[PDB]
Structures are given as structure tokens and as C-alpha cells.
Design a binder for this molecule. Structure first.
Ligand SMILES: Cc1cc2nc3c(=O)[nH]c(=O)nc-3n(C[C@H](O)[C@H](O)[C@H](O)COP(=O)(O)O)c2cc1C
Ligand SMILES: Cc1nc(C)c(C(=O)Nc2ccc3ccccc3c2)s1
Ligand SMILES: O=C(O)c1cc(=O)[nH]c(=O)[nH]1
Length: 365
């Protein structure tokens, strides 16, 4: 595609050269929300369709949380070609996040480091924004374009569980699925919620609140986890997920590790690292969680996806759906159709009838 080359070689590096990453992101969100996007030519074939989490997904490629933190660009994101959209993380009260600068590009590594710290418009603002297009979303969902809402907690909150509970109550009725984000590396103490006792307590409350919602407004509940967990952490999470009937896992958030070989000048900035250096660490975590849950717990795979091959590797490792964010920074909007086109070609080449046949295929080898 000509657009791919142009965006990759000319548009994005020029956007990068003119703007700091946070300003560039704000502009990208603005343009997306207005539908100012290149022609997403790609037509989703039937082999890309996936049924999971109580929904049809027209294609398995979603936008990861963090790009549209406040629910401002959902429709533009479907227009960009994503098969599902996840917004957030959203915190109960509005909060500004960390002091700037708080996001950094590592172009030599095709990576990003960020320490936003849950900048959020808060539940009330996001609730009204989603309500204003609620019925349109109901039609998109029925048409195979579901919406996820990712929940965070306020910096100063005492009771983390009540923060998530409030999120379930307020945005649960507007979501096809909710994500309990306990893996941000940029909120103090948050990742300790992944520990077995804390996680069991937290998710019991979350699921209780969720089950209290009326049937048509009752979302699936997923937990998003870190790529930096011990084997013990992962066994415990799998055990709690099965004990409580958690509907799925998002694997993974950004890494606090700094893999050997990073070249970017900004590699030693504090924050979560995303993009290419995270890719295989994420894929291996998917592989492990799929095996630990016996392939019975839907996984959304995320981390360093920028091609059909990247997507297919996560799917074969056990992901039913995948997401991307960082690749947009470097490739722009044409990366979405690129991933889908390459994925379809590889599925055919490898003998799969469709995405569904490929899920977890590595484990049946
Ligand atoms: C700038 C930025 C902000 C992010 N914000 C969130 C967030 O608010 N909540 C969340 O669950 N993940 C957040 N993420 C993580 C992404 O959703 C994703 O898990 C991670 O970036 C790995 O995927 P990627 O390599 O395709 O970017 C953020 C990532 C980036 C780069
Ligand atoms: C016909 C057009 N007019 C404008 C202003 C376009 C544009 O730059 N769109 C972009 C560019 C980069 C992006 C990067 C991320 C997300 C959306 C994006 C949209 S395409
Ligand atoms: O807001 C953040 O800084 C943020 C949250 C999250 O879940 N992941 C991330 O990399 N950063």
C-alpha cells in the first residue's frame, strides 16, 4: 500500500520531528475523533471474524487502552479499521496524572516509555460521553464492533477495591467488557493488587458489583496483567481466575524491565516500556497463561504488535483477540489494515480456515 510507505517514511517522522510525543498524541486523538483519517480500504473477510466474551468481533485487532483514555475518539477508531475499541484507563475522580514530561519515544527501538500516571477525566465525564452515543454503540456491537472500558484507581484512594467497584457501577452498564487494570507500573502500590490474596478480594467485589447489574447491561470482566510477573504470580492469578470465574485476561501491560540491547537515548527514563522490545515477553506470558488456564479463559494479547506475523504469533500462543497502540506512533493509521491483510494471508498459508482455528494452535503441536 502507498499509504503505508507515505505515513511510515514521511508523515509520522515529520509529526515526530515537529511535536513532543504528548502533543502529537493529543493531535492524533483530535484528528481521529473528527474522522480525519486516510482511506481504510481493507475489507474484513469472514475468516477474521471471532466469537468470544459473549460477542461477535468482525476482526481480532483492537486499539489498546491508553490511546483514547477518556472515550473521545471511539467512532473514529472503528473507522480506522479496529475490530473493537477499548477506552481508559478511567479513574473515579478526575486527576491530572504525573508532572511532564511523561512520555518518551525510542525510535531506534520502535518503543515508547510512558509514566502518565492515570491522567483521566474521571467516571462522570466519561459516563456522559458514552451515554451520548449509547444506542449507536449498541448497533456497532450487534454489528460485530464491541466496546471495552478499562478501569483504574485514583492516586489518593485508600480503598482500591471501592475505586474499581465504583467503575463497575458507573461504566459497567455502557461496556461490552470491563478491564480491571492492576498492572500499570505508574501508580504506587497498584501492581501489588496482582498478588493472590489482594486479587481474590478485589475481584470478588468487582464480580459481585457486576452481577448486580441488569442483564442487558452486564459486561464481561477481564483482568489486565503485567509482563513482569514471577512464575508464582502467574500460577496464583490463573488459580484465582478459575476460582472466581473471571471472564478473561488482557496480557500484557507495559514492562518496567529494560531488555538488554535498547539503543534509544531515553531508555533510562522511568516508566512502562512498550513496542517491539516488549513483543516476545508479552507473547511468552500469553503462552504461559493460556496453558495455566487450560485454554478455557479467553485472552486478549497485547504488546509490540506491528504486523500480521506479530498478531498471528500471539493468536497461536493462545490469544483470541489482539490489541496494539505503540505501532501507531511509528506507522500511523495504515498499520491497522496492514496487520489485518498480513494476518489473513498467513492464516491461509498455514492452513487455517480462520482466526478461530489458529487460537492456541501452538499448544496442540
Ligand atoms: C502512552 C501509553 C499509555 C497507556 N495507558 C494505558 C492505560 O491507561 N491503561 C492500560 O491498561 N494500559 C495502558 N497502556 C498500555 C497499552 O494498553 C498496552 O498494554 C502496551 O502499550 C503494550 O502494547 P503496545 O506495545 O502495542 O503499545 C498505555 C500504553 C502507552 C504507550
Ligand atoms: C485526510 C487527512 N487529513 C489529516 C489531518 C490526516 C492525518 O494526519 N491523520 C492522522 C495521522 C496520524 C495519526 C496517528 C495516530 C492516530 C490517528 C492519526 C491520524 S489524514
Ligand atoms: O497511565 C499510565 O501511566 C499507564 C497506565 C497503564 O496501565 N500502563 C501504562 O503503561 N501507563
Amino acid at each position: 500500500t502507498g499509504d503505508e510507505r507515505f505515513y511510515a517514511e514521511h508523515l509520522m517522522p515529520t509529526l515526530q520531528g515537529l511535536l513532543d510525543p504528548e502533543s502529537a498524541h493529543r493531535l492524533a486523538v483530535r484528528f481521529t475523533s473528527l474522522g480525519l483519517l486516510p482511506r481504510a480500504r481493507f475489507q474484513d473477510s469472514d475468516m477474521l471474524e471471532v466469537r468470544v466474551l459473549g460477542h461477535k468481533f468482525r476482526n481480532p485487532v483492537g486499539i489498546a487502552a491508553g490511546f483514547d483514555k477518556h472515550g473521545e475518539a471511539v467512532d473514529g477508531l472503528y473507522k480506522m479499521g479496529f475490530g473493537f475499541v477499548e477506552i481508559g484507563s478511567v479513574t473515579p475522580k478526575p486527576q491530572e496524572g504525573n508532572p511532564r514530561p511523561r512520555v518518551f519515544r525510542l525510535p531506534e527501538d520502535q518503543a515508547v516509555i510512558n509514566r502518565y500516571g492515570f491522567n483521566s477525566h474521571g467516571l462522570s465525564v466519561v459516563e456522559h460521553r458514552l451515554r451520548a452515543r449509547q444506542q449507536k454503540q449498541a448497533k456497532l456491537t450487534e454489528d460485530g464492533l464491541p466496546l471495552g472500558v478499562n478501569l483504574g484507581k485514583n492516586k489518593t484512594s485508600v480503598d482500591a477495591a471501592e475505586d474499581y467497584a465504583e467503575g463497575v457501577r458507573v461504566l459497567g452498564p455502557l461496556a461490552d467488557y470491563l478491564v480491571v487494570n492492576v498492572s500499570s507500573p505508574n501508580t504506587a502500590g497498584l501492581r501489588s493488587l496482582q498478588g493472590k490474596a489482594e486479587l481474590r478480594r478485589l475481584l470478588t467485589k468487582v464480580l459481585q458489583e457486576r452481577d448486580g447489574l441488569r442483564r442487558v447491561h452486564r459486561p464481561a470482566v477481564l483482568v489486565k496483567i503485567a509482563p513482569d510477573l514471577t512464575s508464582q504470580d502467574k500460577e496464583d492469578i490463573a488459580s484465582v481466575v478459575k476460582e472466581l470465574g473471571i471472564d478473561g485476561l488482557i496480557v500484557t501491560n507495559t514492562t518496567v524491565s529494560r531488555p538488554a540491547g535498547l539503543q534509544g537515548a531515553l531508555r533510562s527514563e522511568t516508566g512502562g516500556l512498550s513496542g517491539k522490545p516488549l513483543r516476545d515477553l508479552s507473547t511468552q506470558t500469553i503462552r504461559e497463561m493460556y496453558a495455566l488456564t487450560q485454554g478455557r479463559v479467553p485472552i486478549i494479547g497485547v504488546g509490540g504488535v506491528s504486523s500480521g506475523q506479530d498478531a498471528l504469533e500471539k493468536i497461536r500462543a493462545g490469544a483470541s483477540l489482539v490489541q496494539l497502540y505503540t505501532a501507531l506512533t511509528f506507522w500511523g493509521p495504515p498499520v491497522v489494515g496492514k496487520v489485518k491483510r498480513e494476518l489473513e494471508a498467513l492464516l491461509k498459508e498455514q492452513g487455517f480456515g480462520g482466526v478461530t482455528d489458529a487460537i492456541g494452535a501452538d499448544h496442540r503441536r
